[PDB]
Write a protein that holds these residues in place. Structure first.
Motif, short mmCIF file in Angstrom:
data_model
loop_
_atom_site.label_atom_id
_atom_site.label_comp_id
_atom_site.label_asym_id
_atom_site.label_seq_id
_atom_site.Cartn_x
_atom_site.Cartn_y
_atom_site.Cartn_z
N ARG A 54 -6.70 0.95 5.60
CA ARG A 54 -6.31 -0.29 6.26
C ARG A 54 -7.03 -0.32 7.61
NH1 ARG A 54 0.24 -0.95 5.53
NH2 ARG A 54 -0.28 -3.17 5.31
N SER A 78 0.82 -1.21 0.00
CA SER A 78 0.00 0.00 0.00
C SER A 78 0.85 1.26 0.00
CB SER A 78 -0.94 0.00 1.21
OG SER A 78 -1.80 -1.13 1.18
N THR A 93 -4.26 -6.85 5.27
CA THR A 93 -5.62 -6.49 4.94
C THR A 93 -6.32 -7.66 4.26
OG1 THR A 93 -4.67 -5.39 3.00
CG2 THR A 93 -5.41 -3.99 4.81
MG LIG Z 1 -3.13 -3.65 1.73
#
Ligand SMILES: [Mg+2]
Ligand SMILES: Nc1nc2c(ncn2[C@@H]2O[C@H](COP(=O)(O)OP(=O)(O)CP(=O)(O)O)[C@@H](O)[C@H]2O)c(=O)[nH]1
Ligand code: MET
Ligand SMILES: [Zn+2]
Lengths: 86, 105, 267, 470
Positions: free
Chosen positions: D70, D57, D80
């Motif tokens: 998240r 991310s 996640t």
């Molecule tokens: Mg992620």
RNA sequence: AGCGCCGUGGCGCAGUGGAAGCGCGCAGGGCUCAUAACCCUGAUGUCCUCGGAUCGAAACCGAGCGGCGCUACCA
RNA sequence: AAAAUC
């Protein structure tokens, strides 16, 4: 989370008590107290302490020995369990 | 770490320098210490004083543990992180790298 | 002045349990004032003072504090009262402190009335408190029933009507107890139209709101719809929420979905 | 002495802002590169893959600037479950003087058509070459259904490798192979940890990675050294994205369809329910435009098990209230992107992981739901995603009848039971329904070590359909 | 983001509506040969901040703060 | 009664 550590409480005449705080419930406690008693020859208590948890109080001053039992019975980590000098 | 033993009392007249050199707020460090150790001690103005029989080795090892799990990045060699709150929990954020990693226990 | 007792008589009856403020102990025990009967000094001797032997003659007895005592003898001739601390049951102490706080609350209310009106508290208790403690057995229950029924003031002559107005104002300010009844319902829809169903079901639910009982069905999540209601009597809110349950289930039986309940109306 | 908000507003109003899309433009002249499309909707879905605890991310936040949310107070830190969506706009500098590597710049989707060049001394205006949607697929060894659903959604790829760690990361290879399973070949190699590496060590790492990607189907995979932390070499990433990756063929000549991957319930708490919005299904539109206000049906929809154990499937009919393709509601939709179709569906259908990997069709078409599916399957030589300390990485065995296998048919995650096994074909009974539209490229994962491990690829050739009950 | 709990004098519970509580600590003393146990003595607070009815409030309410708990990531 | 140390 669920950290494990042992403490020592002294008494009159050099006598000592040992407490491990936090015990996994994967193995039950009476079945563990049975084999604590023989290997240690010390009295033990599964005491209830609020907001603290079930504690297997043991007599004497032994830390490497309760650890040596832990390495074999259920403990496979030897990293979360902490030993206190005091 | 300088640990002054005075009979029944354990004194750390240097914890301010520990907080400054580790770029950590003092009260967070005190919270960590008393989550690790089972005591409730006071602070004098700059110095952390407690009533117990505690060794210097324990202080050194708790400092090293705080360094490894809180102070320095666990993916990079950096102290530049500081303490913030992202919904309500402590969410560590760095300044040199800015990576989002958080340890609260 | 603040002197009159809370109860009827002047000297205590036998085998009754009250709560006393300690003032001084000399050699035979604590001869201390009473705070439930008429103010008078009664003696609590040592072997009647502590359930434990007498190891801490300073700890369990506190000069200037109140603890439960029991009447052993009453000399209704000159001045003397016999009291004991040990002869109170473990459960009984709770009711004794309940009665003491009861007495203190009523005494504080009537003391406010006397201080504002400059009438001696003896007249306030005589004209008012004792008739109510005779009709209902107590003056506090009588204030509570005055809140819901003025008729308790019928048949008694007040010292002045303004005193009645001030005391009713004070008991309304203080002794007022709008019970908050919450229910929560789970919309478990899988059907085609559920949002307009929720809209009109809650519109009907808010429609039945009365000027005195107001309902605002709030949202905390998609399935969990919370019904918050105030019930001035604790019996109307449950009927309101049951009617709401009827409304939502009727709305959802036709659109195709299903609505389930977790917590029915409970205060 | 201008404040930051005033400077941003001045740049926004200088650049034209975000012009509203025409309500009903001529769709026969509308390419994915048109201004009405390019400035306000994504046309290419590019997704990031990498092994656990790598910063998947963070790299997208560096590229775009929008967070993936998240969530869940436990997924805050480790992993996640739901994907991470992100929007970035690729802007090139129109002045030839500035260096070509630094000409490109990925900005947030809130930017205008023509933002000024932030390079010190450049008065040129940025031109939007493309806006791209970002899909982040979690890379944990228990959660692979979401990664395969994303791969079905994918159009372009970005592979990530760590420097200081061991070169042969099993999970990166698993992600790669899963991508080549899904007819995807535009893969760009990214080395994230270069800052904590030395001059020589990165050279041996790149040699090992080059030797690693030699026998796989994808050959021309450019390698990019990036920094999710120092936030450099981002313009090179954008340049490589624009050059190497062209648009997969997509136009308006095909019937509309939708593949809903996420469930979103618009239930802002505290306010009165007299003012609410529609229940939103977040789905990828791989083909067929949608316009503001439509009648649509989620084909699997209601799945009930009657008093005999049989399965009944009712399509969820709904009128489309809104299409949250981007920050502002759009009049139409463009294939090759993720759009939140907000309909009148009750929000509890969108509350939890319920509308996860389901197939949806517009009125005028009847996608067919199937209970037993005939499948043509090919398999790999050895298992992937498993670490073996130097002994013959586990070989994929052959299938056996009456066993549960996670059959990710595009986005649909089902536990199928194999009724029969042949040399190349097998029959699957699905306890959870799936609808077959055209081909619906399948991936397969077998339970060998507790959790699932991918095995191979498959295509639907026949099926036993069930008639939906209106 | 929404609704429930809490606000020490070092720590907890209690009263919440006459204005500073107790125990646990801590410190000292006494008990004694001497340690516990036991018996005495203290010194710390706009009991989180801001307003309001109230002779009066730390207590009754509220317009905000900090930390916990559930709904649940709420396009 | 509970009694401890040595
Ligand atoms: Mg992620
Ligand atoms: N050295 C370094 N550490 C990074 C970088 N990006 C993230 N990290 C750190 O490594 C960890 C991984 O970051 P995170 O975004 O949580 O990982 P992820 O890629 O989302 C995990 P998964 O692959 O399972 O989806 C974090 O703890 C973060 O601090 C980077 O560029 N360099
Ligand atoms: C702003 S809609 C994009 C997806 C959403 N941010 C998740 O959750
Ligand atoms: Zn860092």
């Amino acid at each position: 989370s669920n950290y494990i550590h042992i403490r020592i409480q002294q008494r009159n005449g050099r006598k000592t008590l040992t407490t491990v705080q936090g015990v996994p419930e994967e193995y039950d406690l009476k079945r563990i107290l049975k084999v604590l008693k023989k290997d240690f020859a010390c009295n033990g208590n599964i005491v209830k302490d609020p907001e603290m948890g079930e504690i297997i109080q043991l007599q004497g001053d032994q830390r490497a020995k309760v650890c040596e039992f832990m390495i074999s019975q259920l403990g496979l980590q030897k990293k979360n369990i902490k030993i206190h000098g005091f | 770490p300088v640990c002054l033993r005075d009979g029944k009392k354990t004194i750390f007249s240097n914890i301010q320098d520990i907080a400054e050199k580790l770029h950590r707020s003092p009260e967070h460090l005190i919270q960590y210490l008393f989550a690790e150790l089972g005591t409730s001690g006071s602070v004098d103005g700059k110095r952390l004083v407690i009533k117990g029989k505690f060794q210097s080795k324990q202080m050194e090892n708790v400092l090293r543990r705080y360094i490894l799990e809180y102070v320095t990045c666990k993916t990079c060699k950096s102290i530049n992180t500081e303490l913030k709150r992202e919904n309500r929990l402590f969410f560590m954020v760095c300044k040199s790298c800015g990576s989002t990693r958080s340890v609260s226990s | 002045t603040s002197h009159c007792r809370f109860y009827e008589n002047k000297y205590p009856e036998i085998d009754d349990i009250v709560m006393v403020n300690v003032q001084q102990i000399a050699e035979m025990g604590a001869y201390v004032k009473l705070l439930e009967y008429d103010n008078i000094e009664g003696m609590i001797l040592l072997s009647e003072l502590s359930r434990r032997r007498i190891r801490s003659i300073q700890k369990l007895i506190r000069v200037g504090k109140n603890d439960v005592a029991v009447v052993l003898r009453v000399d209704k001739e000159k001045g003397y009262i016999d009291l004991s601390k040990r002869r109170v049951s473990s459960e009984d102490i709770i009711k004794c402190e309940e009665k003491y706080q009861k007495s203190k609350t009523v005494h504080s209310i009537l003391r406010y009335c006397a201080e504002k009106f400059q009438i001696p508290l003896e007249e306030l208790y005589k004209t008012i408190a004792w008739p109510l403690s005779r009709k209902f057995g107590h003056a506090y229950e009588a204030f509570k029933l005055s809140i819901i029924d003025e008729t308790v003031w019928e048949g008694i002559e007040p010292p002045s009507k303004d005193v009645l107005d001030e005391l009713k104002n004070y008991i309304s300010k203080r002794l007022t107890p709008a019970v908050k009844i919450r229910a929560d319902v789970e919309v478990s829809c899988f059907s085609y139209e559920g949002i307009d169903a929720i809209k009109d079901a809650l519109k009907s639910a808010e429609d039945m709101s009365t000027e005195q009982m107001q309902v605002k069905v709030k949202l905390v999540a998609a399935p969990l719809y919370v019904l918050t209601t105030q019930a001035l009597d604790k019996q109307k809110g449950i009927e309101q929420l049951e009617s709401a349950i009827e409304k939502i289930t009727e709305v959802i039986t036709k659109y195709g979905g299903v609505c389930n309940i977790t917590m029915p109306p409970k205060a | 002495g201008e404040t930051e908000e005033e400077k941003r507003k001045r740049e926004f109003e200088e650049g034209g802002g975000l012009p509203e899309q025409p309500l009903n433009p001529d769709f026969s002249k509308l390419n994915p590169l048109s201004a009405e499309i390019i400035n306000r909707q994504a046309t290419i879905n590019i997704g990031t893959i990498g092994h656990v605890a790598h910063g998947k991310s963070t790299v997208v936040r560096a590229i775009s600037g929008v967070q993936t949310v998240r969530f869940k107070d436990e997924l805050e830190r480790n992993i996640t479950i739901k994907l991470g969506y992100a929007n970035a706009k690729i802007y090139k500098c129109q002045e030839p003087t500035c260096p070509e590597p630094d000409c490109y710049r990925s900005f947030k989707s809130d930017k205008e058509i023509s933002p000024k060049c932030q390079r010190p001394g450049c008065p040129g205006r940025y031109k939007l070459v493309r806006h791209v949607s970002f899909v982040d697929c979690p890379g944990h060894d228990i959660l692979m259904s979401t990664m395969l659903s994303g791969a079905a959604v994918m159009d372009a790829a970005l592979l990530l490798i760590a420097g200081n760690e061991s070169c042969p990361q099993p999970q990166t290879s698993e992600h790669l192979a899963a991508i080549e399973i899904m007819k995807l070949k535009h893969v760009i190699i990214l080395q994230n940890k270069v800052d904590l590496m030395r001059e020589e060590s990165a050279l041996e790492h790149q040699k090992s990675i080059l030797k690693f990607i030699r026998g796989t189907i994808a050959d021309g995979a450019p390698i990019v050294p990036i920094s999710a932390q120092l936030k450099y070499n981002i313009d090179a990433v954008n340049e490589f994205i624009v050059k190497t990756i062209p648009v997969p063929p997509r136009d308006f000549m095909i019937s509309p369809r939708l593949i809903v991957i996420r469930s979103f319930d618009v239930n802002k708490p505290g306010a009165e329910i007299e003012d609410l919005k529609g229940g939103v299904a977040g789905g990828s539109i791989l083909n067929g435009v949608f316009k503001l206000g439509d009648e649509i049906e989620i084909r699997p929809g209601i799945v009930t098990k009657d008093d005999k154990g049989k399965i009944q499937c009712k399509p969820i009919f709904s009128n489309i209230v809104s299409l949250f393709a981007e920050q502002n509601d759009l009049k139409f939709a463009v294939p090759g992107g993720l759009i939140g179709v907000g309909t009148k569906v009750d929000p509890t259908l969108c509350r939890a992981d319920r509308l996860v990997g389901q197939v949806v069709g517009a009125k005028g078409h009847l996608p067919n739901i199937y209970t037993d599916i005939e499948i043509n399957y090919f398999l790999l030589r050895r298992l992937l995603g498993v670490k073996t300390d130097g002994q013959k990485q586990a070989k994929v065995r052959k299938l056996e009848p009456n066993e549960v296998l996670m059959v990710n048919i595009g986005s649909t995650a089902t536990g199928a039971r194999v009724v029969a096994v042949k040399a190349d074909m097998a029959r699957l009974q699905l306890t959870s329904p799936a609808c077959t539209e055209i081909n619906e490229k399948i991936a397969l994962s077998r339970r060998i070590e507790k959790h699932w491990r991918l095995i191979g690829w498959a295509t639907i050739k026949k099926g036993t359909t069930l008639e939906p009950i209106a």
